[PDB]
Write a protein that binds this ligand. Sequence first.
Ligand SMILES: CCCCCCCCCCCCCCCCCC(=O)OC[C@H](COP(=O)([O-])OCC[N+](C)(C)C)OC(=O)CCCCCCCCCCCCCCCCC
Ligand SMILES: CCCCCCCCCCCCCCCCCC(=O)OC[C@H](COP(=O)([O-])OCC[N+](C)(C)C)OC(=O)CCCCCCCCCCCCCCCCC
Ligand SMILES: CC(C)CCC[C@H](C)[C@H]1CC[C@H]2[C@H]3CC=C4C[C@@H](OC(=O)CCC(=O)O)CC[C@@]4(C)[C@@H]3CC[C@@]12C
Ligand SMILES: CC(C)CCC[C@H](C)[C@H]1CC[C@H]2[C@H]3CC=C4C[C@@H](OC(=O)CCC(=O)O)CC[C@@]4(C)[C@@H]3CC[C@@]12C
Ligand SMILES: CC(C)CCC[C@H](C)[C@H]1CC[C@H]2[C@H]3CC=C4C[C@@H](OC(=O)CCC(=O)O)CC[C@@]4(C)[C@@H]3CC[C@@]12C
Ligand SMILES: CC(C)CCC[C@H](C)[C@H]1CC[C@H]2[C@H]3CC=C4C[C@@H](OC(=O)CCC(=O)O)CC[C@@]4(C)[C@@H]3CC[C@@]12C
Ligand SMILES: CC(C)CCC[C@H](C)[C@H]1CC[C@H]2[C@H]3CC=C4C[C@@H](OC(=O)CCC(=O)O)CC[C@@]4(C)[C@@H]3CC[C@@]12C
Ligand SMILES: CC(C)CCC[C@H](C)[C@H]1CC[C@H]2[C@H]3CC=C4C[C@@H](OC(=O)CCC(=O)O)CC[C@]4(C)[C@@H]3CC[C@@]12C
Ligand SMILES: Nc1ncnc2c1ncn2[C@@H]1O[C@H](COP(=O)(O)OP(=O)(O)OP(O)(O)=S)[C@@H](O)[C@H]1O
Ligand SMILES: *[C@@H]1O[C@H](CO)[C@@H](O[C@@H]2O[C@H](CO)[C@@H](O)[C@H](O)[C@H]2NC(C)=O)[C@H](O)[C@H]1NC(C)=O
Ligand SMILES: *[C@@H]1O[C@H](CO)[C@@H](O)[C@H](O)[C@H]1NC(C)=O
Ligand SMILES: [Mg+2]
Ligand code: NA
Ligand code: NA
Ligand code: NA
Ligand code: NA
Lengths: 294, 976, 32
Amino acid sequence: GSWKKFIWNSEKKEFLGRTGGSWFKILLFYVIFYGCLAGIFIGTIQVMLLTISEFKPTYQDRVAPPGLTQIPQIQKTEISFRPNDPKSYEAYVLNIVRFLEKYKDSAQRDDMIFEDCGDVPSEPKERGDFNHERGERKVCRFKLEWLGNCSGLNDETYGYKEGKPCIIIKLNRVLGFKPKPPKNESLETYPVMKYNPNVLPVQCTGKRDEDKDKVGNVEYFGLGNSPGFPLQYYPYYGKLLQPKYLQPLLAVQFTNLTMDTEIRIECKAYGENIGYSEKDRFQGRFDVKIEVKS
Amino acid sequence: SMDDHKLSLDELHRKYGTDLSRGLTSARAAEILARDGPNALTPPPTTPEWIKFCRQLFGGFSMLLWIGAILCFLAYSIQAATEEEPQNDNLYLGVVLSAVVIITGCFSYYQEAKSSKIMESFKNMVPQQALVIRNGEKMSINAEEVVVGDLVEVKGGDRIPADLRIISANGCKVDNSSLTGESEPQTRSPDFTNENPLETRNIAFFSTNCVEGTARGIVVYTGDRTVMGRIAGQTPIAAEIEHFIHIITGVAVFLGVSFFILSLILEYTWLEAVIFLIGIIVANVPEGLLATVTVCLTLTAKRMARKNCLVKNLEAVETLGSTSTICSDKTGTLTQNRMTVAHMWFDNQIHEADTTENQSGVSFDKTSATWLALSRIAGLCNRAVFQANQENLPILKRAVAGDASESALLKCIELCCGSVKEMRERYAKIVEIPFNSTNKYQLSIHKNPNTSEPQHLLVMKGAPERILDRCSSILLHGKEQPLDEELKDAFQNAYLELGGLGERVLGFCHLFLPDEQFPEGFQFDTDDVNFPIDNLCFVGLISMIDPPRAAVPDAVGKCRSAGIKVIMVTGDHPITAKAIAKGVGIISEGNETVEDIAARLNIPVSQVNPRDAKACVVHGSDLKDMTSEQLDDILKYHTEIVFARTSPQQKLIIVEGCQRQGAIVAVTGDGVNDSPALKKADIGVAMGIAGSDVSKQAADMILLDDNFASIVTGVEEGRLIFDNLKKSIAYTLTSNIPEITPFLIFIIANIPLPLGTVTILCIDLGTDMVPAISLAYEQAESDIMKRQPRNPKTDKLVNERLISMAYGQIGMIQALGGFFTYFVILAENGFLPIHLLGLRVDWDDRWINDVEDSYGQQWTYEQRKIVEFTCHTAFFVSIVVVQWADLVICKTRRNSVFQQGMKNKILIFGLFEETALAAFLSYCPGMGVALRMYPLKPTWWFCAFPYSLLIFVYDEVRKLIIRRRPGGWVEKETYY
Amino acid sequence: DPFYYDYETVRNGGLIFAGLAFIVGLLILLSR
Ligand SMILES: CCCCCCCCCCCCCCCCCC(=O)OC[C@H](COP(=O)([O-])OCC[N+](C)(C)C)OC(=O)CCCCCCCCCCCCCCCCC
Ligand SMILES: CCCCCCCCCCCCCCCCCC(=O)OC[C@H](COP(=O)([O-])OCC[N+](C)(C)C)OC(=O)CCCCCCCCCCCCCCCCC
Ligand SMILES: CC(C)CCC[C@H](C)[C@H]1CC[C@H]2[C@H]3CC=C4C[C@@H](OC(=O)CCC(=O)O)CC[C@@]4(C)[C@@H]3CC[C@@]12C
Ligand SMILES: CC(C)CCC[C@H](C)[C@H]1CC[C@H]2[C@H]3CC=C4C[C@@H](OC(=O)CCC(=O)O)CC[C@@]4(C)[C@@H]3CC[C@@]12C
Ligand SMILES: CC(C)CCC[C@H](C)[C@H]1CC[C@H]2[C@H]3CC=C4C[C@@H](OC(=O)CCC(=O)O)CC[C@@]4(C)[C@@H]3CC[C@@]12C
Ligand SMILES: CC(C)CCC[C@H](C)[C@H]1CC[C@H]2[C@H]3CC=C4C[C@@H](OC(=O)CCC(=O)O)CC[C@@]4(C)[C@@H]3CC[C@@]12C
Ligand SMILES: CC(C)CCC[C@H](C)[C@H]1CC[C@H]2[C@H]3CC=C4C[C@@H](OC(=O)CCC(=O)O)CC[C@@]4(C)[C@@H]3CC[C@@]12C
Ligand SMILES: CC(C)CCC[C@H](C)[C@H]1CC[C@H]2[C@H]3CC=C4C[C@@H](OC(=O)CCC(=O)O)CC[C@]4(C)[C@@H]3CC[C@@]12C
Ligand SMILES: Nc1ncnc2c1ncn2[C@@H]1O[C@H](COP(=O)(O)OP(=O)(O)OP(O)(O)=S)[C@@H](O)[C@H]1O
Ligand SMILES: *[C@@H]1O[C@H](CO)[C@@H](O[C@@H]2O[C@H](CO)[C@@H](O)[C@H](O)[C@H]2NC(C)=O)[C@H](O)[C@H]1NC(C)=O
Ligand SMILES: *[C@@H]1O[C@H](CO)[C@@H](O)[C@H](O)[C@H]1NC(C)=O
Ligand SMILES: [Mg+2]
Ligand code: NA
Ligand code: NA
Ligand code: NA
Ligand code: NA
């Protein structure tokens, strides 16, 4: 090839066609150039961060109706297990136990942070304003005993050992959001359940028509007797003003599932604020497929 | 078939429409033009337009997007067959990949058709002309309208218009290299040689030339019926572009395969990886830089032909711009070629110009025998006559047949001393010798009407220093006084102060052939040289002015500024040539030859060192006695060289000598024997008005107005294309860093992906389709004729400086301008910049529908993908905004845009097209489900304005440093 | 309402700007 000419000379001392005092300047230029570019980039980022608040986002319309999720964090909306096989349902129980750590009664004893809101559903509690004039805001404390037959004060496999499994439903946190339950015209929503003016109602039914004959009985567990989310929480003040906030939960158990069939179940939440989508199959709603092998 | 050469002239009456004299008929011309077709020729059939369209639509690099669209439709068909909820998002990808090739195929076809329409329009610009002898009288016609049974005349240098049959020939020798291949001139005559019309002295053929002589002949075969009518690429600047595209293709294919095998590691579901591969390789290769060359070359030729400079192939355009030496003739090119008579000399007296429109003015018409004798020489040596239809004007306005230098003194001896038809009345005619540039003579023998001098007299004119040795004994006061050395001193001083004014001079003499030997009845012959051509009777000199063309002294200055050597090659005396060269400015004011510096020091000439003289005047007889090493050292030390008394055969030696010193030579020629010099120089320039056909068959370009300034404007137009190509190459390469670096930061820093495949295709489609072609219409700069000629073996199109400017500097600011907008949108929706580091795995998990942001809110998967696709949309918009400033800074190279202007309108249409496409692709309804492009807030459109302004400010200040300090460090490292 | 942001006004403005910036480019190109 072209050896010993375009690599090194030592009759002009030109490595790669450039002398050593010329290699220094062309590298000093690029070091200074990329230094000033990094400086201008950091400076524009820093200036843009001054227009950003630290209590409220600038735009909230892309989380505007929240999602609705279920706590055994599963992989394709599928739950499948054998009750007489303690290695099939172990990951589900581990997920539920790791989620319900902060909801324990021994983790809510700090009375200067937590407070004792009522044991019946009530109106939303305005903690003030997003202006840092009162420091940290107190949080209502959620008792685990309201999730009875679904909490860890009993069967610690949460029903998975004895057939009938149970999920825990929660609504996604949106900063400043107060959910509006539907009105009471007795014609408005579907089909019929117990109505409460301070409860956002949730209902879990079968998806297809052969699933309504196989899902069996469905039990709900929450605060009170009307199934849904209580309203003396909301609207949440953000994790700067309210660390250790506890969102309300709702447990759902399926006591009479049909064996050896895959059952599709749809859970929907109703309200004026709550809206649904056709591409987002997790907005205001979700679905799960349960298959109890025997 | 048998041609009518065996049958004689009686059967030529009885084979065609009864004409062998006085023309055929002007009315029968339309009859035969109605009976048969025009005298045309088309052997290429056609290739149709649809196959040329399909070559563009399915060609190179556009079949990748066709197979990508096929794979998208295939994946959609498998999803729609075998599953419920078909979710047609692989159909919209297929129609996007279809629309992109349809748009780029239509655009490249439109560019190729617009270039071909200009290129097949340089026909019918200098059409052929044939000399027929129609009923009327010797007219020239469009030469596709020659009919059978017509009678044409062909002189020396003309191309034969159709297949002939020679009737009356005066020494035609033709060159039958069209069908034999031999380049030897073979004679033609109405005599018979062979019983075959291919090897006879008879009939001549289509597409040949009489290189000498003059012959009249009848037409037998026209059109696609003749003997030769029946049986019958890659510009060196396009080769560099299509070699550079190979290396960019290699780098793009490597980057595409290396990104493809990393997309599958991050679980991209094979179709997305393949479409990403195809998008990277298509966006990183500048295929549309190949049509730009064809747009840049062809349009340049269209600018040249409107400046009277007509190229014949596209390879001549790009070699005109690198010219280093122009070897030009003088009469007709540097001067106007309209001679007038001034400052005669006889009886040791320089007379006055005789220009008044009143007779017996200041000083003329002292009627001795001398003036009537010299007028007899001026009238009886001429073959030029006044044309017809001219008894309406008197002297200054008539049209004269023949050359200019004979018509000029015809226009002088009509003012005084009677008429010239009176002189044809008086004296007789026997024989003549026509002037050629190898003898410099013109002599003619004539019979006196009277017996006052009963001896028969011959008249002679020519070049004065070549006449005087023959025509010796000066007739001073009607006498026969012999020569003295002071008589030749008076002659030399007279020629000195006649050539000092820049005047052309001729010399005149006569002999009186005495009838002591041959009586009054005695026939005479010439090429039998039986008459004395030595010791004749000299009379005196007549000079003519020749005014220079009005645009020449600015053109010589523009050649001097641009570093172009100009060599004057004349056939005149070294006095007149030196005076004309000092007049127009070839020999500059400040350079001197050896002779004037020897005369100003009063020292003899064989003592001065020839290295303080920058100028030179080389006699033509000394050029024969120069060896090949004695020639190029005159082409090396002197800057201003003038060759005088140079025969047109000696031009080839000068061309080869200039080429042996490493130059690109442009050479002007207009004769039959100028053709060896024309197809040896790098640019042959023929003349269009006073030009032969053999000259404009052998030249690379034609001067439509015979002007030296038009060659210099052709050099400017050839110099423009390298700037205009470099600017377009520098613009197309800057959009590769923003199309590559998002995936690298996505895989290194683990942030959500800032730019996707569809928006890469949109970026490339808009911002590299129209504004890349707009930079070929850019005008010139203020200093294009202020730089050295490029050396087309050392200066390439693509440097190291160009690559480091396009990739290393402008592309990085263009990438940062989009990354800033990305962080702005994600910070305003709720994800601050430090939170984004390491979020890629949870963000792209389809079954995690509560992802916590900086404020504590929880996000569904399709809720956060809409924010990511808004970020993709604004990346595309910010790239458009910085490409505005890139296109504005790329239009100059060292001038600023404040002293250049915004007169390019294709560029402004490209800017508006960019902005309109970016606004429509974002704000149209239905774009969210097809392209997945979402609307932007109005305040997010101004996020890339600081980086556009930074590009503009930096690239203005760098050009100011280049202009203020030439040869500095910045011009070494940043001048591409 | 901090959760609405009507996009129809900016869409109308963007399409008006697209039509304007297209016809002005058409009048600049065909000005010859
Ligand atoms: C997978 C990782 C991807 C890495 C990032 C991608 C960037 C790489 C793209 C650059 C390659 C393109 C160069 C093509 C060369 C064309 C060949 C040619 O004809 O040139 C003739 C010329 C011939 O040279 P010459 O004729 O012009 O003059 C003499 C030059 N010498 C003395 C060197 C011979 O060769 C060159 O172009 C030399 C190239 C020098 C390198 C130029 C600087 C490039 C800097 C780009 C890196 C900046 C960062 C990139 C992004 C990273 C950020 C994450
Ligand atoms: C905020 C942006 C707006 C402002 C943008 C500023 C743009 C300016 C960029 C180009 C200017 C570069 C300055 C070079 C000056 C040296 C030239 C000179 O004086 O010649 C003689 C001197 C002396 O060398 P020399 O001319 O004699 O060359 C040597 C040749 N012999 C040996 C034969 C004599 O030139 C140099 O040596 C300078 C070399 C160092 C190169 C520059 C050092 C780093 C500074 C460059 C940073 C550029 C800032 C970019 C930031 C913009 C961010 C986008
Ligand atoms: C791109 C070139 C031409 C100029 C560089 C522009 C920026 C200056 C680049 C350089 C390196 C980047 C970042 C890479 C490393 C991080 C670690 C970061 O420290 C952290 O807080 C992360 C770890 C933690 O504390 O949790 C502070 C600096 C920072 C943001 C850097 C800030 C500047 C970045 C964006
Ligand atoms: C031309 C290409 C190579 C650049 C595109 C990649 C980005 C420039 C990368 C480089 C490092 C990244 C980031 C790494 C972390 C820093 C921290 C950040 O710090 C702050 O501004 C706030 C810190 C504070 O206020 O405490 C400055 C910029 C930033 C986001 C960097 C911004 C640019 C990122 C996304
Ligand atoms: C295109 C060229 C310029 C390369 C990109 C330039 C950036 C400056 C590069 C250099 C190394 C990159 C990153 C590699 C190491 C990380 C660790 C990171 O530390 C963390 O806290 C990350 C936390 C986590 O990942 O979980 C801070 C700096 C950062 C983002 C770096 C920021 C700058 C990156 C993107
Ligand atoms: C502005 C100069 C530096 C560029 C010259 C050519 C551009 C075509 C100019 C003409 C007017 C300029 C802009 C003026 C403001 C509008 C706002 C933008 O629309 C919005 O304001 C968002 C909300 C809405 O459209 O209703 C549409 C494009 C844009 C940036 C224009 C795009 C084209 C600009 C950059
Ligand atoms: C050019 C360099 C050397 C100096 C940088 C000066 C720039 C003009 C600065 C000043 C304020 C900066 C930015 C601050 C915020 C961004 C995003 C956006 O601002 C908002 O997000 C406010 C929206 C809202 O809160 O309603 C529009 C303006 C922009 C692009 C600004 C563009 C100009 C920046 C980069
Ligand atoms: C976001 C911005 C930084 C990108 C585009 C900035 C351009 C550099 C702007 C600045 C002002 C604009 C132009 C406004 C009109 C004039 C016409 C022209 O005025 C003349 O005197 C030309 C006279 C001639 O024909 O010779 C000089 C350049 C030009 C300034 C400007 C060229 C550069 C423009 C397009
Ligand atoms: N028709 C003519 N009869 C007698 N002498 C002539 C004639 N024409 C030209 N000459 C002289 O002979 C010289 C040689 O002829 P040319 O080659 O034509 O020179 P030129 O025309 O002056 O210069 P160029 O640029 O080569 S055309 C001329 O320069 C005249 O001095
Ligand atoms: C919660 O679980 C308890 C046992 O863990 C259920 O109590 C038993 O329910 C069965 C149902 O027929 C009765 O026969 C038993 O007598 C009950 N035992 C006790 C100790 O109460 C209880 O029904 C469950 N609650 C539900 C399903 O709402
Ligand atoms: C489950 O038990 C209930 C008893 O109330 C019965 O009505 C229902 O049909 C049972 N479902 C199945 C699937 O056996
Ligand atoms: Mg001539
Ligand atoms: Na391309
Ligand atoms: Na040639
Ligand atoms: Na570009
Ligand atoms: Na590209």
